[PDB]
Design a protein around this nucleic acid. Structure first.
Lengths: 201, 147, 102, 98, 203
RNA sequence: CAGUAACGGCGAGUGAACAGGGAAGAGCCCAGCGCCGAAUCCCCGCCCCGCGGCGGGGCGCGGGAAAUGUGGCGUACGGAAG
RNA sequence: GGCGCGCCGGGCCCGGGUCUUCCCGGAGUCGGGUUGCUUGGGAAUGCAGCCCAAAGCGGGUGGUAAACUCCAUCUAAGGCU
RNA sequence: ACACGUGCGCGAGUCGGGGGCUACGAAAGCCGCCGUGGCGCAAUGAAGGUGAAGGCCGGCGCCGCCGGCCGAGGUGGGAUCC
């Protein structure tokens, strides 16, 4: 029975909820387990990056996040072809591939090609047969400076470009942002019936 | 801390501070929000008006991304661009207005609440209020729409 | 006159140039290859037409192609598959009507 | 701050203790009824041993469970503000010169 | 290619040719026992798709499942509960009759392992399914790198746990807006996580 | 996200998902369509190093599987051939 | 047990890019009706029974039923990890 | 879980709680392009949506509007201060 002025609430505790309580005393021991399983991974892949392969510059979808840039799944096949990268040689030298990623845009396509010119120029490749050099492999001294990269390889920072201070021209001053919004709202909406009553007459 | 609690002052006292006449019985008004229309009508009317009944249109697959439009006012608009710009654009004689990209700061609409200090601005915001435009134009600046 | 790029309107969204590549190989899945056309061309001559189509053939012949469409809809399910079916019953009947006189 | 930050951060190295769910509820008990001159407590089902008809469930019964058995999901740990943690050390270092 | 000609010939089951073949075989299959070994696949073509290679060690049974819905097994139709649970007649078993067929073949031959199954005829009383079985211990399977996955003890009774094709179609999993209730491993795994107090150490 | 959209004598109560931020991160194989003298596969006998996970090699107009389709190439990211 | 530099045994002798002609896919199954169960899923989210039962510029999806349009996105009814 | 009171810290912010980094210690310390995200800073409408001060003084006894300095009220009671 409710006492007085006080919030209405519906506690989700009507099931046998005590049997299925997940207590987090695993947590401090889990972080030890996940860390030892991360160092011993990195110690195996001895000169390779510890985060592993390079991820592409990728826009977030759905208009809340679409001004931000992530690390995606992997590079698209139209990003590997333009870079001169073979899709199955990509995985083996530490380049992320997914066959799924479309390309609706050229700038987001071209962003991930310049991304890969960096990597192949940054790539130190050790010969499979160590004591006999092969062609595509990097020089002897580049194998000797070879260290791991702790952190995501070519880390993705969202950068807005430097706009300067401008004297506002008599045209930009004169633009009516509110009415231009309110006009286009009606032109986006009512078009359907203005196309239909014009095809009529 | 159990020692600081009330149970520690109720040892010796028979009823334990829950009445001697009306005994502390388990659920004497029903479990939870029972009798909201019947025997708790007055509590649910006096403090929770509108609780019972329907209103308006159902919208089945509603995502909170399509309806995302967070607002900055013209009050705190000069906080988004550093103190170094505001003084330089005031001090300089050329009349070059510093560009305030509102989409960069995280907001998609500029509303016109505050009194904007009298130096020209350029606002690259996505949506605008009518009053928000008038103040930017009133001081003497541009309302740049952005996609 | 300046038209700024807007997040709403009849031509809205961000100013981005659009590349045009060859579409991915699964988009053309279930399009009619001539080799696979011949198999259905072969088997239709072997098997015949289903007993629901024999009623559907004999009602198109009296020019009841609505009563056919209402019938084919009931048998095959939707208004969309049935209209596609009826444009394939009449096509093989207009094929017979060439052979009917000649 | 020192006698608040110390008293909450020293709860964070505290291992859980609890009484088992089964502890007390491993009998097949039932109250004899309203008659029979005994106190309506869940007595143990009949036998030729000492337990047969004693009194099984309840906090007051010999054997049995405890009232409100201690749980593993007791809020053992107390998180403090990062700022207050520094404002304890700046208050601890400051008072160990004087 | 011969198989594509049999492929579309099995899609005209309504035809004069296949209203005879599915009718005279559906006669034939009732007179043989409820669960017996077929000497070959009735459909070579359909078994091709479902992974049956015609080498040594691949087994095909031809089992029948009595047709219709599952009625509630209660004495004299009395269900001792609320008017909701009174139902007995018009109830439907969660798994398909095809998956019921596989886990009778798979139950019988415990030494074998169910790969998949396919339809070969229905009556008013009996659906007939050829159930494809593989020897995990015949050295033609056991030494083939692309069929040695079945031989591991992880794939013991795929038919029972519902890891065969018809077995998976009642679990209600797959991707997207339709298959939310089986996000995670299964329906039970989804239910489990969603009904756990994640009582953290701190809060 | 979220006790949110939604369900419900719309009462009691029930109640996801996407995006996002992380842990890990790995990709793939057939059938079908086609080409290669079935080019494939299991088992027995004989000997040889040799194996408390019966395996590698030779050896037989020895048997069997298999054109009602075995092996290779090849699978939606396309693929084959010249 | 855990791994590379050389004696070495059998097996395997393999790739890339463009131009050019050929080829390209799983059916009592999707889908539809009706029924029962399930779901947050609401003119039916998922599952099953039964009846009807397709297509190949197709098919599914596009969270309010439908008809006509455009447009987007995957490629179901086979398998592994 | 909620409401209110009270104590502490910072304050248009604030909080790592999940994650990662480095005997007691499963502790503690740290990260800020780990501040996603939570609640707060904006309300309102079923919704599409919209979304929080102005007087006068000159040009065109008056006009939309070109201007123009100025400017978050008024009243009454108000602890303190002058």
């Amino acid at each position: 029975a409710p006492s007085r002025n006080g919030m209405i609430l519906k506690p989700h505790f009507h099931k046998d909820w005590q049997r299925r309580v997940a207590t987090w005393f695993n947590q401090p021991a889990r972080k030890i387990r996940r860390r030892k399983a991360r160092q011993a991974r990195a110690r195996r892949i001895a000169p390779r990056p510890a985060a592993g392969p390079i991820r592409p510059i990728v826009r977030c979808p759905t208009v809340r996040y679409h001004t931000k840039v992530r690390a995606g799944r992997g590079f698209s096949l139209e990003e590997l072809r333009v870079a001169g990268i073979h899709k199955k040689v990509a995985r083996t030298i530490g380049i992320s591939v997914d066959p799924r990623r479309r390309n609706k845009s050229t700038e987001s396509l071209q962003a991930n090609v310049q991304r890969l010119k960096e990597y192949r120029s940054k790539l130190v490749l050790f010969p499979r047969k160590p004591s006999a050099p092969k062609k595509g492999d990097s020089s002897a001294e580049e194998l000797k400076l070879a260290t791991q990269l702790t952190g995501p390889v070519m880390p993705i920072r969202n950068v807005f470009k430097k706009e300067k201070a401008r004297v506002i021209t008599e045209e930009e001053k004169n633009f009516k942002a509110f009415a231009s919004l309110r006009m286009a709202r009606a032109n986006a909406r009512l078009f359907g019936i203005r196309a239909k009553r014009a095809k009529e007459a | 801390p159990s020692r600081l609690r009330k149970t520690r002052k109720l040892r010796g006292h028979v009823s334990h501070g829950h009445g001697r006449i009306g005994k502390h019985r388990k659920h004497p008004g029903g479990r939870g929000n029972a009798g909201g229309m019947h025997h708790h009508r007055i509590n649910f009317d006096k403090y929770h008006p509108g609780y019972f009944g329907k209103v308006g249109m159902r919208h089945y697959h509603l995502k909170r991304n399509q309806s995302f439009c967070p607002t900055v006012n013209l009050d705190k608009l000069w906080t988004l661009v550093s103190e170094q710009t505001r003084v330089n654009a005031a001090k300089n004689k050329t009349g070059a207005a510093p560009i305030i990209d509102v989409v960069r700061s995280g907001y998609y609409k500029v509303l016109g609440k505050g009194k904007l200090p009298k130096q020209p601005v350029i606002v690259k915001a996505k949506f605008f209020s009518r009053r928000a435009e008038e103040k930017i134009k009133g001081v003497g600046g541009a309302c740049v729409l952005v996609a | 006159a300046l038209r700024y790029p807007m997040a709403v309107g009849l031509n809205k969204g961000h100013k981005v140039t659009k590349n045009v590549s060859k579409p991915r190989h699964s988009r053309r899945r279930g399009r009619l290859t001539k080799h696979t056309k011949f198999v259905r061309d072969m088997i239709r001559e072997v098997c015949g037409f289903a007993p629901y189509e024999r009623r559907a053939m004999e009602l198109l012949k009296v020019s009841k192609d609505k009563r056919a469409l209402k019938f084919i809809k009931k048998r095959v399910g939707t208004h969309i598959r049935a209209k596609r079916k009826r444009e394939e019953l009449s096509s093989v009947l207009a094929a017979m009507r060439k052979a009917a006189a000649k | 701050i020192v006698n608040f930050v110390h008293t909450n951060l020293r709860k964070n190295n505290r291992q859980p203790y609890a009484v088992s769910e089964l502890a007390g509820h491993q009998t097949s008990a039932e109250s004899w009824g309203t008659g029979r001159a005994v106190a309506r407590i869940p007595r143990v089902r009949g036998g030729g041993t000492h337990r047969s008809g004693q009194g099984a469930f309840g906090n007051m019964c010999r054997g049995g469970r405890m009232f409100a058995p201690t749980k593993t999901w007791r809020r053992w740990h107390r998180r403090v503000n990062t700022t207050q943690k520094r404002y304890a050390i700046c208050s601890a270092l400051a008072a160990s010169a004087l | 290619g011969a198989y594509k000609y049999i492929q579309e010939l099995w899609r005209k089951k309504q035809s004069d040719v296949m209203r005879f073949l599915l009718r005279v075989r559906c006669w034939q299959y009732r007179q043989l026992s409820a669960l017996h070994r077929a000497p070959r696949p009735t459909r070579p073509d359909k078994a091709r798709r479902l992974g049956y290679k015609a080498k040594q060690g691949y087994v095909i049974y031809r089992i029948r499942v009595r047709r219709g819905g599952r009625k509630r097994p209660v004495p004299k139709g009395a269900t001792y509960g609320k008017p909701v649970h009174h139902g007995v007649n018009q109830l439907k078993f969660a798994r398909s009759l095809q998956s019921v067929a596989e886990e009778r073949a798979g139950r019988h031959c415990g030494a074998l392992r169910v790969l998949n199954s396919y339809w070969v005829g229905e009556d008013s009383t009996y659906k007939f399914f050829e159930v494809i079985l593989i020897d995990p211990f015949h050295k033609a399977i056991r030494r083939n790198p692309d069929t040695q996955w079945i031989t591991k003890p992880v794939h013991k009774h795929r038919e029972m746990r519902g890891l065969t094709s018809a077995g998976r179609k009642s679990r209600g999993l797959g991707k997207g807006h339709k298959f939310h209730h089986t996000i995670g491993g299964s329906r039970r795994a989804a239910w489990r996580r969603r009904n756990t107090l994640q009582l953290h150490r701190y809060r």
